[PDB]
Design an enzyme around this catalytic site. Structure first.
Site, PDB file in Angstrom:
ATOM      1  N   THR A  30       3.599  20.695  -4.186  1.00  0.00           N
ATOM      2  CA  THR A  30       3.744  22.004  -3.221  1.00  0.00           C
ATOM      3  C   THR A  30       5.119  22.467  -3.636  1.00  0.00           C
ATOM      4  OG1 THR A  30       4.119  19.544  -1.704  1.00  0.00           O
ATOM      5  CG2 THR A  30       4.667  21.970  -0.755  1.00  0.00           C
ATOM      6  N   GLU A  63       0.267  17.597 -14.526  1.00  0.00           N
ATOM      7  CA  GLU A  63       0.269  19.565 -14.641  1.00  0.00           C
ATOM      8  C   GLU A  63       0.701  19.671 -16.206  1.00  0.00           C
ATOM      9  OE1 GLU A  63       2.151  19.574 -11.891  1.00  0.00           O
ATOM     10  OE2 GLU A  63       3.215  17.212 -11.760  1.00  0.00           O
ATOM     11  N   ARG A 113      10.552  26.667  -7.385  1.00  0.00           N
ATOM     12  CA  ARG A 113      11.523  25.871  -6.663  1.00  0.00           C
ATOM     13  C   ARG A 113      12.132  25.104  -7.210  1.00  0.00           C
ATOM     14  NH1 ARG A 113       7.652  20.263  -5.990  1.00  0.00           N
ATOM     15  NH2 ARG A 113       9.362  19.075  -5.619  1.00  0.00           N
ATOM     16  N   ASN A 995       0.118  12.617   0.607  1.00  0.00           N
ATOM     17  CA  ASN A 995       1.240  13.266   0.844  1.00  0.00           C
ATOM     18  C   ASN A 995       1.495  14.962   0.309  1.00  0.00           C
ATOM     19  OD1 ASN A 995       4.417  14.179   1.324  1.00  0.00           O
ATOM     20  ND2 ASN A 995       4.572  14.280  -0.642  1.00  0.00           N
TER      21      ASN A 995
HETATM   22  C1  LIG Z   1       5.210  15.862 -11.841  1.00  0.00           C
HETATM   23  C2  LIG Z   1       4.693  15.369 -10.866  1.00  0.00           C
HETATM   24  N1  LIG Z   1       3.829  16.698 -10.078  1.00  0.00           N
HETATM   25  C3  LIG Z   1       4.008  16.560  -9.124  1.00  0.00           C
HETATM   26  C4  LIG Z   1       4.125  16.243  -7.641  1.00  0.00           C
HETATM   27  C5  LIG Z   1       3.825  16.563  -6.840  1.00  0.00           C
HETATM   28  N2  LIG Z   1       3.530  15.532  -5.701  1.00  0.00           N
HETATM   29  C6  LIG Z   1       3.968  14.485  -4.996  1.00  0.00           C
HETATM   30  S1  LIG Z   1       3.194  13.519  -4.461  1.00  0.00           S
HETATM   31  C7  LIG Z   1       2.041  14.339  -4.892  1.00  0.00           C
HETATM   32  C8  LIG Z   1       0.754  12.885  -4.186  1.00  0.00           C
HETATM   33  C9  LIG Z   1       0.940  11.619  -4.412  1.00  0.00           C
HETATM   34  O1  LIG Z   1      -0.313  10.605  -4.888  1.00  0.00           O
HETATM   35  P1  LIG Z   1      -0.329   9.275  -4.156  1.00  0.00           P
HETATM   36  O2  LIG Z   1       0.164   8.164  -4.322  1.00  0.00           O
HETATM   37  O3  LIG Z   1      -1.481   9.265  -3.918  1.00  0.00           O
HETATM   38  O4  LIG Z   1       1.072   8.847  -3.123  1.00  0.00           O
HETATM   39  P2  LIG Z   1       0.166   8.640  -1.305  1.00  0.00           P
HETATM   40  O5  LIG Z   1      -0.890   8.967  -1.438  1.00  0.00           O
HETATM   41  O6  LIG Z   1       0.658   7.524  -1.111  1.00  0.00           O
HETATM   42  O7  LIG Z   1       1.161   9.409  -0.524  1.00  0.00           O
HETATM   43  C10 LIG Z   1       2.603  15.081  -6.042  1.00  0.00           C
HETATM   44  C11 LIG Z   1       1.228  15.341  -7.024  1.00  0.00           C
HETATM   45  C12 LIG Z   1       5.441  15.736  -8.269  1.00  0.00           C
HETATM   46  N3  LIG Z   1       6.069  15.284  -6.985  1.00  0.00           N
HETATM   47  N4  LIG Z   1       6.423  15.740  -9.859  1.00  0.00           N
HETATM   48  S1  SF4 Z   2      -0.967   7.671   6.933  1.00  0.00           S
HETATM   49 FE1  SF4 Z   2       0.104   7.202   6.125  1.00  0.00          FE
HETATM   50  S2  SF4 Z   2      -0.116   7.448   3.496  1.00  0.00           S
HETATM   51 FE2  SF4 Z   2      -1.027   9.023   5.125  1.00  0.00          FE
HETATM   52  S3  SF4 Z   2       0.144  10.719   4.770  1.00  0.00           S
HETATM   53 FE3  SF4 Z   2       0.805   9.304   6.916  1.00  0.00          FE
HETATM   54  S4  SF4 Z   2       2.411   8.570   5.711  1.00  0.00           S
HETATM   55 FE4  SF4 Z   2       0.736   9.248   3.888  1.00  0.00          FE
END
Ligand SMILES: Cc1ncc(C[n+]2csc(CCOP(=O)(O)OP(=O)(O)O)c2C)c(N)n1
Ligand code: SF4
Ligand SMILES: Cc1ncc(C[n+]2csc(CCOP(=O)(O)OP(=O)(O)O)c2C)c(N)n1
Ligand code: SF4
Ligand code: SF4
Ligand SMILES: [Ca+2]
Ligand SMILES: [Ca+2]
Lengths: 1231, 235, 118, 59, 117, 58
Positions: A30, A63, A113, A995
């Protein structure tokens, strides 16, 4: 040629990138995530780039991986791109040096950002671009959506020709996310500006085994310095090349650019140097002020690197007598920020005039840079001349901020309607807004602008929109303050938020509310509002959208009605065209399930227009007067910080309100009581079988099991009903299920899983509950939790514990929270939580609201989010600190025993020493010691007295989802786990990156439809469990709440206690998986996931191997053909069916085959006699030895890398052969 | 007190680091590899730091992992260090922002080394320190082996007291690898310069389930800008 | 036109072999996460890991590939943990050709792996 | 021998380490072309990303 | 492709200084670890044995399908599939849906089928 | 008549202390930087010293 289009800055730039690129290595971050996703959907739709080919997009693990992929592609001849922001960008820094180092035409589009320091931020600023200032990449900034398109084009062409990579950035959210009516270009036109001789050369300079060359070489000092300066001629030419292209594009567009551009008065005395979107707003004020005779100006910077001083000057009026350089960043400890630093060097290096340069900072983290603030920047130039100031904040600690006067007039062009809409999440407000913009912008020739403020709360969060229309181009890159039309689509707002702030005199105002009569209206609207509505002479229109929507058949869905009010009362269009244009769109969109829907929408427009009349009101409103505060006790902090922020007044908090290191106290969630569930489960005592599955399941801690012995239930409410307690241990108590109807999301999970046929819990609208169930909750709240009566870690006994994580801003029926709540209901008092970024950190720590709380005793989970890429290695840090600090305590305690310390003291001390790592004995003894050394302050004994927060063994947890554990953070997860030390990792598996947009992760299943897996993932799930199970010394288990809560608790107990690493992967539901019947069906779904064979539950515990028993245990039974009825129930799987049946039927068979194989392999592991043994550790003891001792031949080389302090002693470098060859030789000459 | 010694800049600084540290999360990168290895052999030989304890060294998978480990340790109350150079340093940049962001007494000893652009280089220059110019870390440069010892000491003490991390750098090879006759200090003397009130506070400000707090929070635009300027008095 | 275009893309006519070279420190440690991703990507690339069971180039520092009891840097008392099983670890995917080799033992089998892997 | 079999048409993305040190220390470069002027296209990206680099070329 | 272990182990380890130094300087610990390594290779090879003989195993397809077509995970979904967070906001997002605040389908219906009026 | 200001504490950059080390007779001063930021208008140390000189206003 040209094409009108009304979109944001992101797609404005992704338009140009897809056109100019042959390859894209990608990763979601984001606010830049969109770009990559569009680049991908488009490619998936056959869209062709300028070479007539579809784009090759691939998603990397991080990345940095994307940075390296981008590097190898360019090296290999393809033109390439990537989209990134803040941390993502920082990870691309090492490559960026190689990329420009090797002169490749890369192009990075970054939605500038903020960087995570004291806190993280998805918002916009230049902290990340400035971080890549030295990598060698050229930088070109766009300051408006129109400019993102052009500047992206310039950046591509110039890169191709110059061979110097380009980073094109625009502010995150303020440009990336601003809808605006722009003019784009056809790919053919972009294609026509490409230097082909340059492009054909990029091709030949590339890697190819047909004509190879070696790049990357390691160079010594004799030639490094030279080869580094060898690229100069290029950087000398990159500016003219940029100027050449700003010129060519302008030739086709009419929009002209310069490296640095002046705007304002030719004889301005006070000039400003800005970069990014501030310029638009600054320009807008410049006009206003200048129309009044003021001598002010602005130099908007375009090409920040290289920094051509020559061009800088060619834009600065000769009359500039004072000039302030605005920087959207903060480099702690520098003598000034980058832009300011650059301008200065130009002025000195110029050696003539010296205008007195002042330096200023604005907009960090997307802070507003409204007009008043600019007025302030200016007034300063002529008044105080405060140097190094801040604008936008009240800096009361250092005192660097400029004062701001909001009485400043409105500066938007003449003839501009400004609108604001207040809505609830998922009422379609924002959608409607985006629609009204396409409609207006496409059928009128007025400029349209749209910006949308959101909410950190995932369910029921507020959302305020800012729209703007006008005959003149809209340069207002700031929120709307003087609203012409303000609309409120959720009646609940009126009371709580400042809906009418700044509304213009006689500004219409519509409200969605059923208070149709002056009576009800009077008995709801607050004093301030009636008054506001009155003295400002507003055109108040009330509308009961809910009912008209229900009436016209749209089942109480207010969107189309509140859409009507805009078109009708907004003032942007003449009545007949407004209602015209609206209907035409009702047919374009819709025309889905035939006419019925359509017509039923048309009728809504009709009655909407009909029922939309002015609410006439009493002059009395002019002095309607004040209300009383039915306010509860809330903290000294909630009162002072968390409430102000939640009521949209956080900008008002000065810097002294916040802690230098950005920390926050726990449990601020307790006082929130949003109360947004529609329906809340209601108890039915006569059906409850007393089981505690409901609380154990509530993803927000909405259900509270009371077990109170009868004399505590005295002043209890009349209606505080309680059953007799079933149970041996449970006899003198009465058990009651207390529903917190104000901290419920009405997900429906509890009732749905509630065991009896005649349900114990039943869903009822919040209003049938709240009056009676509010006071009861409180009552039940100040009653003791029976932590000791039942076995802590027994399903029922667990629900009789203090939940140390409540009311998270997470989705209704989220699949993550049930797990993490019980994890704290078992280890809360002594745990460290290193939370990887993702929904975990977003729901677990979004300032000001924090779910995690302390217990009756003031202790609870020490919580902290390091980053996304390193949750595990972070939690390994804490682990190490505990070792050292806890070791210190033990050597100190071990020493005290050799002292004249009390006998009791010594008795506690060895007991502790003996039970240091027992979370029972360590505490049993540490407490005796905490009392025994009370007051102690001198020497040894005093030391140990002060290390009391180290006495009891702590539980180090590492929290994160599948994207972290399987992708970005895996490498680390793996290392920490291989380290064999005692930490516990808990992975919430959502099978995708939740997320940020439901992007496909390496954990996503075969055939699941996610982002970048748009045709259903065409690869199997990464088997992390079997992958880490290869070590042999790491406790590994999988779980699913819906299936076995008993087995979950058995894993929590076993994982935490294995003296070593533990991996715990849990099936977690998500809005992104798209559960057809609702998130209430979540538990039922986790449960089907295990039955189906889709998600088998197992446990690999090395201590069993220690006793000669097989450590692998299956806990789930074989698959039962549920598979398809399971998959076909989630939209993630069902969309592919709807839209790609031939392919989808194939993949659900793949998944049905896979789970069939994995489970057959899970079967003979359980039965294997062969297996990997175990030892916790035990040996070493003081002693160090270099691998080089007593070796016969040399063990090191002549390389400067191997040279050590004590190296250099002679040896056999193997140049003379093997021992026996040396000897057979000696034994062959001898002489 | 003082002690004559004839060694390089690396061990000159690893002398001071081992003394002032309770934890070290590490990773090998020329020319700074030595420091970490000595920190490790010494620990393996029972050598005690100023608190009378041997050092806890662990080797990470990369220096970004080491950066994060260094972060979690400090957060968790232990004083920590790390040795790094050029690319290793670049990988520690994201954390460095968090480390000074959360005002922790970290200390990074870097044998300033060149960055790989058209070519790679193990040799010395300031391309990597200047890359971390904005992370918020304080920077203190030593220009000779004798100065590596002193300046490393200054950097440790000042960090403890100021709560602003420190990066102490010296040129790669030209100082890191230059043997020279210097005067070192005994650990007891280093120990004697430590602000204890500051150190005891670092301990209390730390993470602990007995008295928890949440750090790392995600902030919106209403409060980000402010909370960012909240550390000024320190700098 | 067309025919000429194709005439100029002559360094693209014959299938090329994309190799990724690195030792144990890269593949098992610092670069693993990536090694894993690329390998999971299922595309046609060939990774060749030279296993020295330690970080050679820089000082013989112990890697995650170093064996139980081998004496390296930071494993000064002999590594007290097993070798990371990368082979069995990536063999879990199912779609990645995985093989191990040793020249001194079979040069025939090495060639059979080169031919099969590529 | 890897090059004695695929030399004429290979891309080599070399992770840092002895591979790159022995394989590419300016000025001396081991890798050569064949009688026909073709041989291994060689390049060291960094240490941390050899694979993802060679994945770039692949793309 | 290799045959079972042939007890060479120790004569193999004791031949490399990397393993022999620990012996010279830490015999009590070293004799233990070379046994660990001799046990490990013994296990791994016994596991390498019944894999060669396993009837169970992971099938294969090089790839082959897709074909032009894109579909968001959000199409034709009944409940909301995205949140009010600024991170999930997309260009074409904002259309209304069921945010799950009102319960399960059947709970919504048993409710409608319980008030109706 | 030549001199040298050896910088110790590069960050934070205390201008006040910078000056307290620069002789009043310095008529020309060259800032040596051990780095190369491609495309900047000058290297970091040089850039810093400048801002001090302008910000000093004498
Ligand atoms: C270095 C970095 N790259 C990208 C992001 C963007 N970001 C944060 S949430 C997300 C993915 C979240 O992954 P997951 O562990 O599947 O989370 P959940 O499904 O539990 O939300 C990313 C890529 C970040 N925070 N830091
Ligand atoms: S259901 Fe939970 S894990 Fe999925 S988008 Fe919502 S807060 Fe995140
Ligand atoms: C990001 C980064 N960190 C550290 C280094 C230092 N370095 C290069 S060689 C080396 C280890 C080499 O590992 P391995 O793959 O075992 O190589 P080989 O044994 O084949 O020499 C490291 C850490 C580096 N080049 N880049
Ligand atoms: S409906 Fe959901 S949020 Fe409400 S009490 Fe039940 S489980 Fe909790
Ligand atoms: S799930 Fe139902 S029966 Fe069980 S404790 Fe809750 S209300 Fe009672
Ligand atoms: Ca454990
Ligand atoms: Ca292959």
């Amino acid at each position: 040629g040209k094409k009108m289009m009304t979109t944001d800055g992101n797609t404005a730039t992704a338009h140009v990138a897809y056109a100019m690129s042959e390859v894209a290595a990608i990763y979601p971050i984001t606010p830049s995530s969109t770009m990559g996703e569009e680049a991908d959907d488009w490619a998936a739709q056959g869209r062709k780039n300028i070479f007539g080919q579809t784009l090759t997009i691939r998603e990397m693990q991080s990345e940095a991986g994307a940075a390296g992929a981008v590097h190898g592609a360019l090296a290999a001849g393809a033109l390439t791109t990537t989209f990134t922001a803040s941390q993502g960008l920082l990870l691309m820094i090492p490559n960026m040096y190689k990329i420009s180092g090797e002169l490749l035409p890369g192009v990075f589009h970054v939605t500038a950002r903020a960087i995570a320091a004291h806190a993280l931020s998805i918002f916009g600023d230049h902290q990340d671009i400035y971080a890549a200032r030295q990598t060698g990449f050229a930088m070109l900034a766009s300051s408006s959506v129109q400019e993102a398109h052009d500047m992206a084009l310039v950046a591509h062409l110039a890169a191709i020709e110059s061979n110097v990579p380009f980073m094109h950035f625009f502010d995150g959210f303020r440009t990336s996310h601003e809808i605006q009516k722009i003019e784009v270009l056809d790919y053919a036109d972009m294609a026509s500006l490409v230097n082909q001789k340059a492009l054909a050369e990029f091709r030949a300079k590339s890697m190819n085994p047909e004509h190879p060359h070696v790049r990357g070489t390691a160079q010594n000092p004799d030639i490094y310095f030279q080869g580094r300066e060898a690229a100069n001629p290029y950087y000398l030419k990159v500016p003219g090349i940029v100027a050449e292209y700003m010129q060519k594009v302008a030739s086709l567009t009419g929009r002209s650019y310069k490296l640095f551009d002046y705007v304002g008065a030719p004889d301005a005395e006070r000039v400003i140097v800005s970069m990014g979107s501030s310029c638009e707003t600054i320009e807008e004020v410049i006009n206003h002020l200048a129309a009044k005779g003021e001598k002010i100006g602005l130099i908007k910077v375009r090409l920040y690197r290289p920094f051509v001083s020559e061009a800088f000057f060619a834009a600065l009026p000769a009359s500039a007598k004072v000039i302030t350089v605005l920087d959207r960043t903060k480099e702690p400890g520098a003598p000034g920020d980058p832009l300011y630093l650059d301008v200065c060097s130009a002025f000195v290096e110029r050696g003539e005039a010296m205008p007195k340069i002042l330096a200023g900072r604005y907009g960090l983290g997307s802070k507003e840079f409204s007009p008043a603030m600019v007025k302030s920047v200016y007034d300063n130039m002529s008044g105080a001349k405060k140097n190094h100031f801040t604008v936008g904040i009240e800096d009361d600690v250092t005192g660097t901020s400029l004062p701001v006067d909001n009485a400043f007039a409105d500066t938007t062009p003449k003839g501009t309607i400004q609108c604001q809409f207040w809505g609830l999440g998922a009422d379609g407000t924002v959608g409607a807004n985006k629609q009204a913009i396409k409609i207006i912008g496409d059928n009128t020739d007025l400029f349209a602008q749209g910006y949308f403020s959101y909410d950190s709360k995932k369910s029921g969060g507020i959302t305020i929109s800012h729209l703007r229309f006008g005959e003149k181009p809209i340069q207002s890159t700031y929120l709307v303050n003087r609203a012409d039309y303000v609309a409120c689509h959720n009646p609940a707002y009126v009371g709580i938020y400042d809906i009418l702030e700044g509304i213009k005199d006689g500004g219409t105002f519509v409200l969605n509310s059923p208070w149709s009569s002056l009576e009800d209206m009077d008995k709801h609207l607050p004093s301030g509002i009636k008054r506001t509505i009155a003295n400002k002479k507003l055109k108040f229109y009330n509308i009961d959208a809910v009912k008209i929507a229900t009436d016209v058949g749209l089942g109480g869905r207010i969107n189309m009605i509140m859409q009507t009010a805009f078109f009708k009362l907004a003032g942007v269009l003449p009545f007949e065209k407004a209602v015209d244009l609206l209907k035409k769109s009702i047919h374009k969109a819709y025309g889905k399930k035939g006419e019925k829907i359509v017509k039923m929408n048309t009728d809504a427009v009709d009655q909407a227009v009909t029922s939309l009349q002015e609410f006439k009101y009493p002059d009395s409103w002019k002095d309607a007067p004040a209300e009383t505060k039915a306010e509860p006790m809330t903290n000294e902090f909630f009162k002072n910080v968390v409430k102000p922020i939640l009521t949209q007044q956080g900008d008002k908090l000065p810097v002294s309100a916040f802690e230098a290191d950005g920390r926050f106290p726990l449990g601020t969630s307790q006082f929130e009581k949003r109360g947004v569930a529609i329906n809340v489960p209601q108890w039915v005592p006569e059906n409850c079988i007393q089981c505690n599955q409901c609380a154990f399941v509530c993803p927000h801690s909405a259900i509270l099991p009371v077990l109170a012995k009868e004399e505590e239930l005295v002043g209890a409410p009349a209606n505080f009903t309680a059953l007799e307690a079933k149970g041996k241990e449970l006899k003198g108590y009465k058990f009651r299920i207390q529903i917190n109807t104000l901290d419920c999301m009405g997900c429906g999970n509890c009732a749905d899983i509630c065991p009896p046929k005649e349900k114990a819990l039943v869903m009822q609208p919040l209003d049938t509950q709240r009056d009676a169930q509010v006071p009861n909750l409180e009552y039940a709240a100040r009653i003791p939790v029976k932590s000791e009566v039942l076995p802590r870690d027994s399903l029922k006994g667990s629900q009789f514990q203090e939940p140390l994580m409540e009311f998270s801003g997470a989705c209704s029926g989220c699949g993550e929270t049930p797990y993490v709540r019980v994890i704290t209901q078992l280890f809360g008092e002594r745990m460290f939580i290193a939370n990887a970024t993702g929904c975990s950190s977003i729901w677990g720590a979004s300032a000001p609201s924090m779910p995690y709380k302390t217990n009756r005793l003031g202790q609870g989970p020490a919580w902290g989010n390091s980053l996304f890429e390193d949750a595990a290695e972070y939690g390994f840090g804490m682990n190490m600190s505990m070792f050292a600090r806890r070791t210190h305590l033990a050597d100190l305690a071990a020493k005290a025993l050799e002292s004249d310390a009390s006998g009791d003291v010594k008795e506690a001390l060895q007991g502790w020493l003996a039970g240091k790592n027992d979370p029972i004995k360590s505490k049993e003894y540490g407490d005796k010691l905490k009392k025994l050394l009370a007051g102690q302050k001198d020497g040894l004994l005093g030391q140990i007295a002060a290390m009391s927060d180290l006495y009891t063994k702590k539980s180090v947890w590492i929290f994160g989802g599948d994207g972290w554990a399987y992708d970005i953070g895996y490498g680390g997860l793996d290392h920490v786990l291989a380290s064999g030390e005692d930490v516990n990792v808990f992975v919430m598996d959502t099978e995708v990156y939740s997320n940020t947009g439901g992007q496909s992760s390496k954990a996503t299943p075969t055939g699941a439809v996610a982002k970048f897996a748009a045709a259903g993932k065409r690869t199997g799930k990464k088997d992390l469990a079997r992958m880490v199970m290869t070590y042999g010394y790491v406790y590994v288990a999988t779980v699913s709440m819906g299936y076995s809560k008993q087995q979950f608790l058995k894993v929590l107990k076993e994982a935490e206690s294995f003296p070593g690493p533990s991996l715990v992967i849990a099936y977690a539901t998500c809005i992104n998986q798209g559960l057809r019947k609702g998130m209430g069906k979540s538990q039922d779904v986790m449960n089907t996931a295990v039955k189906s064979g889709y998600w088998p539950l197992f446990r690999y515990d090395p201590r069993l191997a220690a006793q000669g028993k097989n450590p692998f245990q299956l806990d789930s039974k074989a698959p039962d053909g549920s598979v398809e009825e399971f998959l076909m129930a989630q939209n993630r799987f069902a969309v592919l069916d709807r839209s790609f049946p031939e392919d989808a039927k194939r993949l659900r068979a793949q998944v049905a085959h896979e789970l069939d194989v994995r489970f057959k392999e899970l079967e003979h592991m359980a039965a294997t006699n062969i297996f990997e043994s175990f030892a916790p550790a035990g040996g070493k003891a003081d002693g160090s030895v270099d691998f080089g001792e007593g070796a016969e031949f040399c063990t090191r080389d002549d390389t400067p890398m191997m040279a050590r302090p004590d190296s250099g002693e002679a040896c056999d470098q193997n140049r003379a052969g093997t021992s026996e060859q040396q000897g057979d030789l000696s034994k062959r000459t001898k002489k």
